[PDB]
């Protein structure tokens, strides 16, 4: 077998808006369906069983609903803590089979980074890498532009991107930009700059330092 | 309470095989059906099998047929799953669950999960930089370590041996060009709380058996 289709991996929902999670099966499993949530620690809970049971210490927000095929999970009220990957599982027939998840994204209100830029340490210049790391902090949406300049010279090719998980309390990312430079590269040049641009900054932010 | 503790991350390589342990403790071990679950790069989930403690009886996913084997000790409340002939398609986290009857049958714990890495490459430790400004009078402040060049996936991070966790921002490894990975940590604070705390990471890295502490100096002091 039995196929379980989440159509929708990636959805979009707003803090106290009402969220709908649907699962389809190949063929009818008879409400022997269950629902996970999966945080992005890798952590796994289950909420709901036999189609609209709550597990004990769920909250009341959530529900399930469906029959002979079609099965949804219901979030009567997003809270930030419901940052998740939820999944159905049928147990029906062997082998249990589960659908391929649905990822939250929780749409709150714009807040611009705080931003910090590191030189390298000489504990590492001295094996002959230089990583220079710009952080943009608990901002919101996830877009931003990160642009370094080495003397002024726009960079381009010699950086790579993380952005945590949206945070479980305040819905905001974190991402660090590490320009990767020789040592004989990173000592040819003086000044060291991260340019941001995001949508809660009236102008981009740059953070710099002199070796 | 209720806790399935997975035994550690393991690279293995091509062909081998690895047992995989959930020690579990706070119910009657030999009362509920153990079963295993993967879930690979995709976070893609299956049923593996599982096994009734009591009496040694298993159920495979026919996919897992010629892949695992499922075993408990009675003794230790533990349960095993040893995974044979592995290639990289089996590279993935695996988690044993405990089955709660309510027929309503459902997987009412889990454990934490257990990074499998499947590889020719030998293991590397990280090594661990600090991160601090070149100097200071903001609203908050940031400090953190650089955790580079490590093989294979996982390393843990915490901050004053668990004592700080919050502000902090541990950022997901990048595979690097070199085909090792890294990854930051970083933590904020409020600039008049700065100076109430001295600021220290300690990095693991189980499958190169690495413990490291990297202390981020302040530089509070001027002449």
């Known amino acids: 077998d039995i196929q379980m289709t989440q159509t929708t991996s990636s959805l979009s929902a707003s803090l106290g808006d009402r969220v709908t999670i649907t699962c389809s099966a190949s063929?009818?499993?008879?409400?022997?369906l269950n629902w996970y949530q999966q945080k992005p620690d890798g952590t796994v809970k289950l909420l709901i069983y036999?189609?609209?049971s709550l597990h004990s210490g769920v909250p009341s927000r959530f529900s399930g609903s469906g029959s002979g095929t079609d099965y949804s999970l219901t979030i009567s009220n997003l809270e930030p803590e419901d940052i998740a990957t939820y999944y159905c599982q049928q147990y029906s027939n062997l082998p249990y089979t589960f659908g391929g998840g649905t990822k939250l994204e929780i749409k709150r209100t714009v807040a611009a980074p705080s931003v910090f830029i590191f030189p390298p340490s000489d504990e590492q210049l001295k094996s002959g890498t230089a990583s220079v790391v710009c952080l943009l902090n608990n901002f919101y949406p996830r877009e931003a532009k990160v642009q370094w300049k080495v003397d002024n010279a726009l960079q381009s090719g010699n950086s790579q991107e993380s952005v945590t998980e949206q945070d479980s309390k305040d819905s905001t990312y974190s991402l660090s930009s590490t320009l990767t430079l020789s040592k004989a590269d990173y000592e040819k040049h003086k000044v060291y700059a991260c340019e941001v641009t995001h949508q809660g900054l009236s102008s981009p932010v740059t953070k710099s330092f002199n070796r | 309470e209720v806790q399935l503790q997975q035994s550690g991350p393991d690279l293995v390589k091509p062909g081998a095989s690895v047992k995989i342990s959930c020690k579990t403790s706070g119910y009657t071990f030999t009362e509920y059906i153990m079963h295993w679950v993967k879930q690979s790069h995709g976070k893609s989930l299956e049923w593996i099998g599982g096994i009734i403690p009591n009496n040694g009886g298993t159920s495979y996913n026919q996919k897992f047929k010629d892949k695992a084997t499922m075993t408990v000790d009675k003794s230790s409340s533990t349960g095993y799953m040893e995974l044979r002939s592995l290639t990289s398609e089996d590279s993935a986290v695996y988690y044993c669950?405990?089955?709660?009857?309510?027929?309503?049958?459902?997987?009412?714990?889990w454990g934490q999960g257990t990074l499998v890495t499947v590889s020719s490459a030998s293991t590397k430790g990280p090594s661990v930089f600090p991160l601090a400004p070149c100097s200071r009078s903001e609203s908050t402040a940031a400090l953190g370590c650089l955790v580079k060049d490590y093989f294979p996936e996982p390393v843990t991070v915490s901050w004053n041996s668990g004592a700080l966790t919050s502000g902090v921002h541990t950022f997901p490894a990048v595979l690097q060009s070199s085909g090792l990975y890294s990854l930051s940590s970083v933590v904020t604070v409020p600039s008049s709380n700065f100076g109430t705390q001295t600021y220290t990471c300690n990095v693991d890295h189980k499958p190169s058996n690495t413990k490291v502490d990297k202390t981020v100096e302040r530089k509070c002091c001027v002449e």
């Open positions: 063929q009818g499993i008879n409400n022997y």
């Open positions: 036999y189609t609209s």
């Open positions: 669950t405990r089955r709660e009857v309510y027929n309503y049958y459902a997987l009412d714990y």
